Write a protein that binds this ligand. Structure first.
Ligand SMILES: OC[C@H]1O[C@H](O[C@H]2[C@H](O)[C@@H](O)[C@@H](O)O[C@@H]2CO)[C@H](O)[C@@H](O)[C@@H]1O
Length: 460
């Protein structure tokens, strides 16, 4: 009597698989038939069993999800595995017990059938082109069989280092390079090892942004910089200086329109004005921002959504945003322009420059599968095109995309602001820094702490 298992393959969590174990003898003679699993480096774990008496038992993990069935005609025991999970992943073995005639019994085993539950999970921000990133992921599943789900959870920059440390979290994490040094110091990211030929496809300056202590900690995707987005119909010759916005606002408020609406909550949007001169520069830049809210030119709790919506609706003449925001404007019927950020105290407003980068989670089993996705499928002409047609990436890191980038007037304006700004250091202290600026700007905006007292608490 020999037991032969079948139906073992790769599947997506939530999917299904029917294991079948056929014997070379009648199942009637068997007392008990059942399924055991063995994951790498672990003990035998019974999942299900069926006795000659038709009673079926299951282990608590698989209970409710798996059903053990039997067909005495086909001389086969089945395991219908529904709603699969990564914890299920193991080698599944078929077992049969037979009482002899005398007191003793016989245990019979099979070859084993491998079941792999694999899901490629990607964490990217909701303001980016996750739908397009999914279209790349859909082509990956066609050529391999691995599922590529794209998730966009709130506060992922500070949810990733908590979840990825303890739990599983994502396989690959997408965020501007500045947050990655903190992940690298903490040991939350795998070292990137790309071959020369892949390495050569991207601009050498882009690789520098994704380097911490002489180790590549991510894959560079695109350079991001804030620009001044303006409605050409409401404002044909927009302000070249910050100091002439109050005058323009007085003019526009008479006609039931705002001058400038942008995200005041997130400090990345307010930093260019703050850092225009520089300290004395931070005091100057912020006082101006405070005076705008004090003169009722800007709203106190202006966030990403009400600013975006207001510009797209045609209520505000200007807004401060990144490449990613353009597609939503195109959807609306607004003749828009992207240009240089306004100057403050003569000198330019220095926006921080981000390099969108993809890193592999140190606690991921799919490190080689993610490297394949990132190199051969995402960081390709075809791959970046898909992401870019959803929501624009900005100035891509791919060398082959220079011609297409250069043909776009908005990219030109983005690069103009990126040169006037500076790339963020990747250092672990960036997190504490950003938090210090986030509070400082909110406190001064609402009317709690003074501009002098804001820089005091922030420098500490
Ligand atoms: O607001 C501070 C925040 O700014 C930057 O995050 C940007 C991100 O880089 C952009 O891609 C865009 O989506 O908006 C974010 C701000 O809303 C820094 O990268 C980040 O560390 C910092 O927390």
């Amino acid at each position: 009597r020999q037991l032969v298992e079948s139906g073992g393959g790769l599947v997506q969590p939530g999917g299904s698989l029917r294991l079948s174990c056929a014997a070379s003898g009648s199942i009637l003679y068997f007392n008990r038939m059942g399924w055991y699993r063995q994951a790498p480096g672990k003990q035998r774990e019974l999942v299900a069993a069926i006795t000659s008496g038709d009673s079926t038992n299951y282990a608590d993990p698989v209970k409710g999800r798996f059903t053990i069935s039997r067909d005495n005609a086909k001389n086969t025991v089945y395991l219908q595995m529904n709603s699969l999970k990564p914890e299920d992943t193991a080698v599944y073995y078929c077992n049969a017990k037979e009482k002899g005639w005398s007191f003793s019994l016989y245990d019979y085993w099979g070859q084993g059938t491998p079941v792999t539950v694999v899901k490629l999970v990607i964490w990217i921000n909701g303001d980016k082109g996750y739908n397009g990133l999914a279209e790349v992921g859909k082509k990956f599943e066609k050529d391999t069989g691995i599922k590529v789900t794209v998730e966009h959870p709130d506060k992922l920059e500070e949810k990733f280092p908590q979840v990825a440390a303890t739990g599983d979290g994502p396989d690959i994490i997408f965020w501007a390079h500045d947050r990655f040094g903190g992940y690298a110091q903490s040991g939350l990211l795998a070292e990137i090892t790309p071959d020369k030929a892949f390495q050569d496809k991207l601009y050498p300056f882009t690789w520098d942004a994704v380097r911490y202590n002489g180790k590549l900690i991510a894959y560079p995707i695109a350079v991001e910089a804030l620009s001044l987005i303006y409605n050409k119909d409401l404002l044909p010759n927009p302000p070249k200086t910050w100091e002439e916005i109050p005058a323009l606002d007085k003019e526009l408020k008479a006609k039931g329109k705002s001058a400038l609406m942008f995200n005041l909550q997130e400090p990345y949007f307010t930093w260019p004005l703050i850092a225009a001169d520089g300290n004395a520069g931070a005091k100057a830049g912020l006082t101006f921002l405070v005076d705008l809210i004090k003169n009722k030119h800007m709203n106190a709790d202006t966030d990403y959504s009400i600013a975006e919506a207001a510009f797209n609706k045609g209520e505000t003449a200007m807004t401060i945003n990144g490449p990613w925001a353009w597609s939503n404007i195109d959807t609306s019927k607004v003749n828009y322009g992207v240009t240089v950020l306004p100057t403050f105290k003569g000198q330019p407003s220095k926006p921080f420059v981000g390099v969108l980068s993809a890193g592999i989670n140190a606690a991921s089993p799919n490190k080689e599968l993610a490297k394949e996705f990132l190199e051969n499928y995402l960081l390709t002409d075809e791959g970046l095109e898909a992401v870019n047609k959803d929501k624009p990436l900005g100035a891509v890191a791919l060398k082959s995309y220079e011609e297409e980038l250069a043909k776009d007037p908005r990219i030109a304006a983005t690069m103009e602001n990126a040169q006037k700004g500076e790339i963020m250091p990747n250092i672990p202290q960036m997190s504490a820094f950003w938090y210090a600026v986030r509070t400082a700007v909110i406190n001064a905006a609402s009317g709690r702490q003074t501009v002098d007292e804001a820089l005091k608490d922030a420098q500490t």
